[PDB]
Swiss-Prot record, chain A:
Transmembrane segments: none annotated. It comes from Enterobacteria phage N4. Its main location: virion. GO terms for cellular component: viral capsid. The gene is 56. Coiled coil: none annotated. This is Major capsid protein. It is found in: Virion.
From Swiss-Prot, chain B:
It is found in: Virion. It comes from Enterobacteria phage N4. This is Probable portal protein. Homododecamer. Forms the portal vertex of the capsid. This portal plays critical roles in head assembly, genome packaging, neck/tail attachment, and genome ejection. The portal protein multimerizes as a single ring-shaped homododecamer arranged around a central channel. It comes from the Viruses.
């Protein structure tokens, strides 16, 4: 038999969350912590101070005129009014808040032998090993960032009628699947929190059979939820999902986009992470939703669906040359350099990689998330 | 691989045994050593380089 | 087998901010890169004699 002298290799896995993150420069000789101030407006409820005098000259508990309350009676009760011979009547107070983040360390290494280096039939083995090492490092770092983002969400909307992760179940009267009304509510919440948009509406083209789409935000889903999204129907019973070929004209298709529903442009991320066993126990009445085995009991699987806003978070950069993350690689080939003091044979070697990673969440209200089950 | 053959590293290195030698003469280095100065000299003969 | 028929060529070199700023107009987007830093050159793809 005759070896082909060529190898079969699988490329990297493309990364979606890492490119979004912005980088904040942190000089050394300071520590492992970064902090910022945040000045709250005058009228928000967060303005808890002790500098209040009402219109009658008497001290009052709250220093903000009226909170984030739209009630007309409350506003009329707490309006600032001034008489003609006015003096020392209305006082206001201010407040600032601080936030922080920290840097953590990572790393891994591998070993090999000189006889394996030489006598091996394949030539260029160590190049392959370096390639897989680097790919593994990149994939791990992306997974860590995605995990931290999912853990640090600020706006959470459970689907169906659930309240916590243990309650999200796909069996019974009301299964916990994503619905059109849930997406409408998520849009409403983001609009109320003043989150800026990302894209713009797509008007029509002149070519036959081309629908008009007005989504304005970007949403990341897993691979498992795509059939569920495709099967969704809107309020009037028609189809909801609009595929990309309809509006590819008169618009720009983003990377890894599957379609548009309501006001979100769905994006499929291959390396999306899901919880395992978070849901309630699954009996034999399963309609066909994915489950998992935890402690011998079949529990449902709770799935993500995430809408990262703008300026929500930044990535601390420690000696990264203004990048999100930079790796450090070392190699020592066998020889006298690796001739151990108790073993001058020197038949082995190694290669190691390490980095520093940390994240600062400036505003956690902009991050949004939906938890659902995913069909099998 | 060619550089390792020239400088005697990697696969070209002799095996190590406690009771025996590890001497390898350098044929490739020798043959290259005369060729370098054979080829170099014509470019340095005259004061001017380009005609 | 002919360099003239090549569609593209890619070269990696080491430069400092002085070289880039020697011609301001040529380069855009020079910001968004940290300079007040101190890191090993690294870049395993790049091969160089710099320690």
């Amino acid at each position: 038999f005759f070896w082909l002298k060529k190898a079969i290799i699988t490329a990297r896995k493309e990364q979606y969350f890492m490119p979004l993150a912005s980088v904040t420069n942190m000089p050394k000789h300071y520590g492992k912590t970064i902090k910022v101030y945040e000045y709250v407006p005058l009228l928000d409820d967060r303005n808890i101070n002790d500098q209040g005098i009402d219109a009658s000259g008497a001290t009052i508990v709250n220093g903000n005129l009226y909170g984030s309350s739209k009630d007309i009676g409350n506003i009329t009760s707490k309006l600032p009014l001034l008489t003609e011979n006015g003096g020392r009547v209305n006082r206001v107070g201010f407040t600032r808040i601080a936030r922080e983040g920290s840097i953590h360390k990572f790393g891994f290494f591998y070993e090999f032998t000189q006889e394996s280096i030489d006598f091996d039939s394949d030539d260029g083995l160590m190049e392959h090993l370096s390639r897989e090492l680097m790919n593994g490092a990149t994939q791990i770092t992306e997974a860590v960032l995605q995990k931290d983002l999912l853990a640090a969400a600020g706006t959470v909307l459970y689907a169906g009628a659930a309240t916590s992760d243990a309650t999200i179940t796909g069996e019974g009267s009301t299964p916990s699947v994503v619905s059109y009304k849930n997406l409408m509510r998520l849009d409403q919440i983001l609009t109320e929190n003043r989150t800026p948009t990302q894209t713009t509406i797509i008007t029509g083209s002149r070519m036959i059979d081309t629908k008009v789409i007005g989504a304005t935000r970007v949403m990341y889903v897993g691979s498992e939820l795509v059939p569920e999204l495709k099967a969704m129907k809107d309020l009037f019973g028609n189809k909801a999902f609009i595929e990309t070929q309809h509006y590819a004209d008169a618009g720009t298709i983003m990377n890894g986009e599957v379609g548009s529903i309501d006001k979100f442009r769905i994006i499929q991320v291959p390396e999306m992470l899901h919880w395992a066993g978070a849901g309630a126990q699954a009996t034999g009445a399963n309609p066909g939703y994915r489950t998992s085995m935890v402690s011998g009991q079949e529990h449902y699987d709770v799935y993500p669906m995430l809408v990262v806003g703008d300026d929500s978070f930044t990535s601390i950069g420690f000696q990264t040359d203004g990048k999100s993350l930079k790796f450090t690689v070392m190699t020592k080939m066998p020889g006298k350099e690796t001739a151990d003091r108790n073993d001058p044979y020197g038949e082995t070697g190694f290669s190691s990689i390490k980095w520093y990673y940390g994240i600062l969440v400036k505003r956690p209200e902009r991050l949004a998330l939906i938890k659902t089950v995913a069909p099998l | 691989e060619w550089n390792d053959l020239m400088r005697i590293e990697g696969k070209a290195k002799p095996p190590k045994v406690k009771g025996r030698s590890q001497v390898q003469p350098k044929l490739v280095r020798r043959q290259a050593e005369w060729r370098y100065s054979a080829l170099t000299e014509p470019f340095l003969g005259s004061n001017k380089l380009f005609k | 087998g002919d360099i003239n028929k090549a569609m593209f060529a890619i070269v990696s070199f080491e430069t400092c901010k002085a070289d880039l700023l020697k011609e301001k107009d040529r380069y855009h987007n020079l910001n968004k890169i940290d300079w007040q830093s101190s890191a090993p050159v690294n870049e395993p793809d790049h091969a160089t004699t710099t320690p």
